[PDB]
Amino acid sequence: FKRAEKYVKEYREQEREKIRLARIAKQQGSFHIPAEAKLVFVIRIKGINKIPPKPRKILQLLRLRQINNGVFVKVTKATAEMIKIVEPWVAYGYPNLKSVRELIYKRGYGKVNGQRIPLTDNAIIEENLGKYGIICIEDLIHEIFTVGPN
């Protein structure tokens, strides 16, 4: 409860802080360049027919083996080259908080012992990710959205 309260406060403060920095730069007669995005959401929208081996291997390593499969991906140069290679099969972009929380609430499934278990209770998340400090669904959403150390 306290952790979710802190997370909501942090999200609101980050939004107003970005707006405030842009406004003070505009008022001082300059331009505030916002930070480049750290989180991307990649969706494979093309089928599995007639695909070259290198894009097939990269789509396999991105865990996109089916059309309409989506993954949360950290933005880095080493990953961005792979995504640039598999651009003719995927659509990617920068998701927001509602996208992240709606995805993990509605289609949230975890890999527990090699099995696809729905995220219906916080006990599963605490059992499989509690060593990293992620004990509930709000920590999972916060880690995905803010791109934490885990």
Binding site: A25, G29, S30, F31, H32, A35, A37
Partner: protein
Amino acid sequence: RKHGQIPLSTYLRTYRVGDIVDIKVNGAVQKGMPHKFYHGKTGVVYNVTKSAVGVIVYKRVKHRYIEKRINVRIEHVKPSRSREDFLRRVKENAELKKKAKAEGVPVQLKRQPAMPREAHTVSIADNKPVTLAPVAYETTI
């Protein structure tokens, strides 16, 4: 490589077993020359002899790799800078981790790839932007 005299610091480089060496064949010296293949290849020293060294190369034939042991004179071998980025790094982690453990504060000690840049503010004063057309106007002149 220029024609004539060979530089003499080639003979003053000391090779030991386990060192990583390139093979750059010198055309002037015909003794100890390897094949047409194994030129421009990187390998491991296993045997050190008076004027030659033994290099472990992994040749490819069909659908498998075969180990080859090639005897090459010191004329055609050059020290390879592949693992200098490893040795300097592992030394640097050794003293940095010793210092960080002594001090107390944990650090990020793995090399990280290029992350996206953070937010910053760019001043307009004395750097006023110039307006560009799709073509240059002095070019349309």
